[PDB]
């Protein structure tokens, strides 16, 4: 009786939200950006090849100086690269080799990683002893660690396969806030530039917008037909893009609370692993299972170019803070640095 | 290149040397993935041979490292293991269809197309007793079992009841039928009949891994 009545009200509320989104869908982003000229053909060359990982690379993250980056591989090695010289700055042996994510702190003093061990390990890069040591192991997730991002040297957000995200106080080692509401494994998260909000994509084909301080879900974004594997905020923080196994990328708007544009092609039938934006946000770069990275026009949903330089799955990619270059990691155990030429 | 850059580059090469040394050490062991249901008894298989549970056992001076994770997302991590050890409980007729669908998902997984599966049809003693009692019928759960006959070329074990032999070959055929439906020789299933006291499981994995590695080499020598 009471249970049946309540679940009927949820359906009415879903129709109310769907009608509300349809009310503000006066125009389409495609119609708005029809007049603007296309970006043309985007040609990028492999400037650097980072060699030394001996297994599948699962994650990479640029440092804020746009020169240092950290990559994680399932050979149990965290490597910090000097991208300008291809020199290896550090090689951190992982206690568990099944790493799935890695993060570079914005200060540059810490790196984080974690995988099937359900632990987010914090490594101190600036020690008087001259070696990298584990500073914290964040326990509390009951599933594998899929993504992690620093807010500062003391706070980090992690997404897990136990359908929850958590905000951690690194000094005390306890999760101050738990973000619940996903019905599937959360595979990725992206932080807003002001670090007051973050979006997460799960295997329930939905993206949720979370308030860091308040700790609740503000908005839920649906429209994908399969598991979401990648997510990335727009540079101004008012939009984000997702990548799913249905071979499509979708651009959701926070304020319009709905999808604005889909980035898919008929030839593309493979899943998407990673997504990122260029510095101005005009380009959407996505990594695919078909060994390629497709550069999309974010405004016009046109495939601007292709990065074809890997012999296995493109598992991760990232764009520097200064926008100068993009790095792609792959299951073929190599990292490549790309940018164009005049 | 400055004086500090040369010292930094020399540090990078010392890192590269230890990266290659550790990679060679990691290749000296064979990695196995252990999968199965709650009633499979895969833990008892491991214990006799000996978030992630790991066990190391050695057969003829060859080191095996088996991982029991305790799933379409984290199964991609084990994309380059030597073999998957899939364990089922053949005695429980009710959950046999669950195991067949569970095996079908693993076999047809997009990221396990080149991984051979070492099937372990566990708890054969319970299966033999269940057929002998006759209280439960496989035909109730599988209608096609009533019209199934033991092949003339079959080689039953000595002193084995034909009723048990007919049941064991039918259960094995169901898993093999899934295996032969797809794959095209990229991976091969290696079914085995094991019990709760069998002590030859480790050698069966070792012998099957020899065929798995040999098949890997043959593709390298031929698919050029």
């Amino acid at each position: 009786s009471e249970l049946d009545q309540l679940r009927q009200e949820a359906e009415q509320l879903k129709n109310q939200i769907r009608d509300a989104r349809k009310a503000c869908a006066d125009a389409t982003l495609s119609q708005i950006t029809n007049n603007i000229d296309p970006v043309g053909r985007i040609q990028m060359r492999t400037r650097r090849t980072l060699r030394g990982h001996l297994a599948k690379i699962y994650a990479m993250h640029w440092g804020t100086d746009s020169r240092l980056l950290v990559s994680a591989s399932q050979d149990g090695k965290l490597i910090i690269w000097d991208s300008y010289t291809t020199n290896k700055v550090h090689a951190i042996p992982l206690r568990s080799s099944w790493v799935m994510t890695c993060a570079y702190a914005p200060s540059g003093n810490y790196v984080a990683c974690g995988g099937l061990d359900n632990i987010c390990s914090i490594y101190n890069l600036k020690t008087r002893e001259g070696n990298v040591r584990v500073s914290r192991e964040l326990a509390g997730h009951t599933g594998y660690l899929s993504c992690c991002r620093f807010l500062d040297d003391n706070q980090i957000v992690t997404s897990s396969g136990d359908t929850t995200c958590a905000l951690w106080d690194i000094e005390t080692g306890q999760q101050t806030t738990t973000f619940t509401g996903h019905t599937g494994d959360v595979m990725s998260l992206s932080l807003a530039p002001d670090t007051r909000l973050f979006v997460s994509g799960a295997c329930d084909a939905s993206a949720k917008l979370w308030d860091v301080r308040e700790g609740m879900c503000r908005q839920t974004f649906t429209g994908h037909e399969s598991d979401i594997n990648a997510i990335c905020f727009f540079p101004n923080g008012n939009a984000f893009a997702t990548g799913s196994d249905d071979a499509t990328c979708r651009l959701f708007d926070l304020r319009a609370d709905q999808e604005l544009m889909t980035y898919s092609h008929d030839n593309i039938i493979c899943g998407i692993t990673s997504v990122s934006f260029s510095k101005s946000g005009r380009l959407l770069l996505a990594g695919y299972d078909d060994f390629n990275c497709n550069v999309w026009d974010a405004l016009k949903a046109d495939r601007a170019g292709v990065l074809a330089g890997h012999d296995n799955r493109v598992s991760c990619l990232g764009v520097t803070d200064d926008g100068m270059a993009v790095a792609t990691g792959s299951w073929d155990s190599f990292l490549k640095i790309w940018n164009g030429s005049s | 290149v400055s004086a500090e850059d040369k010292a930094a580059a020399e540090r990078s090469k010392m890192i590269d040397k230890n990266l290659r040394e550790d990679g060679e050490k990691a290749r000296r062991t064979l990695r196995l993935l252990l999968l199965g249901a709650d009633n499979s008894g895969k833990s008892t298989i491991v214990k006799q041979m000996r978030g992630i549970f790991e066990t190391k056992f050695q057969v003829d001076k060859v080191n095996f490292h088996m991982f029991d994770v305790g799933r379409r997302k984290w199964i991609q991590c084990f994309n380059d293991v030597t073999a998957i050890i899939f364990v089922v409980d053949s005695s429980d007729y009710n959950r046999l269809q669950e195991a067949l669908n569970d095996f079908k998902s693993i076999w047809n997984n997009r990221w396990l197309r080149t991984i051979s599966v070492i099937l372990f049809l566990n708890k054969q003693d319970l299966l033999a007793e269940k057929v002998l009692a006759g209280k439960s019928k496989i035909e109730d759960y599988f209608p096609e079992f009533a019209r199934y006959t033991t092949p003339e070329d079959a080689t039953p074990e000595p002193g084995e009841d034909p009723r048990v032999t007919r049941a064991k070959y039918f259960i094995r055929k169901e898993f093999v039928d899934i295996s032969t439906a797809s794959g095209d020789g990229r991976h091969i299933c290696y079914p085995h009949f094991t019990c709760a006291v069998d002590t030859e499981n480790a050698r069966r994995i070792f012998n099957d891994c020899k065929d798995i590695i040999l098949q890997m080499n043959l593709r390298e020598y031929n698919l050029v």
Partner: single-chain antibody, 230 residues
Framework: VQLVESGGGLVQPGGSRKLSCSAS????????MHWVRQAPEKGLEWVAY????????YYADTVKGRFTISRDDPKNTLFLQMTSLRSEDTAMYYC??????????????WGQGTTLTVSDIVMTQATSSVPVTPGESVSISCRSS???????????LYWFLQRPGQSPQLLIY???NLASGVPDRFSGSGSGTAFTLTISRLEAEDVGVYYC?????????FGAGTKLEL
């Protein structure tokens, strides 16, 4: 982090002596090591360098052929085998650790030193002494015969402070960066061949001799040193 030197003492001319540097509290095998000596009432002079992994070894011209530098990583010991010792070799010998990667701080830690008694880019610090008062801003100037700015954007200039009775301490590395544990009042500014070390709100502890060192190329050379006195 500790660096203890031993083996020094009074030796006859033309003799041989073995200096040891025992390291504790840090990963010794990860750091390159230098020997730096200081003649009595004189400035610092770089002697030798051995890299991490012992693959690269450098010597000063005044000691090349007579000194041999070696390390024992399992024992965390640094060695300096000296032969044909001259009266010019009478100095306090300092053991210095230095690690080299992007953003590292070489020459960050110095040893206490051991005393030995026997019976090229030019770095200029024209101002030998500067009378100072507490709370007042002080500037120290350094000059180089060659431009220390490399084509990679780094300017390989270092600043050291040797308080009376103490070993030198790193203040500024690569001409602008502030070493760990150093108050923010110290600031390094420079361009090309001219460099300035600014000390805002001078205190009693800041009193000492300041040395500017170049790390553009070997041999590493030090300035004469500028002494601050109250």
């Amino acid at each position: 982090v500790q660096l203890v030197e031993s083996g020094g003492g009074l030796v006859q001319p033309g003799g041989s002596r073995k200096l040891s540097c025992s390291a504790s509290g840090f990963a010794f095998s990860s750091f390159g090591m230098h020997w730096v000596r200081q003649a009595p009432e004189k400035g610092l002079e770089w002697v030798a360098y051995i890299s991490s992994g012992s693959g690269t070894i450098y010597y000063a011209d005044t000691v090349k052929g007579r000194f041999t530098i070696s390390r024992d990583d399992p024992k965390n010991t640094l060695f300096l085998q000296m032969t044909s010792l001259r009266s010019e070799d009478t100095a306090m010998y300092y053991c210095v650790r230095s690690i080299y990667y992007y953003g590292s701080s070489p020459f960050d830690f110095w040893g206490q030193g051991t005393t030995l008694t026997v019976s090229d880019i030019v770095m200029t610090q024209a101002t030998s002494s500067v009378p100072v008062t507490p709370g007042e801003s002080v500037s120290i100037s350094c000059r180089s015969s060659k431009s220390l700015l490399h084509s990679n954007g780094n300017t390989y200039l270092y600043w050291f402070l040797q308080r009376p009775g103490q070993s030198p301490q790193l203040l500024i590395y690569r001409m602008s960066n502030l070493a760990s544990g150093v108050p923010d009042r110290f600031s390094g500014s420079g361009s090309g061949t001219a460099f300035t070390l600014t000390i805002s709100r001078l205190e009693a502890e800041d009193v000492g001799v300041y040395y500017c060192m170049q790390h553009l190329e070997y041999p590493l050379t030090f300035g004469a040193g500028t002494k601050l006195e109250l």
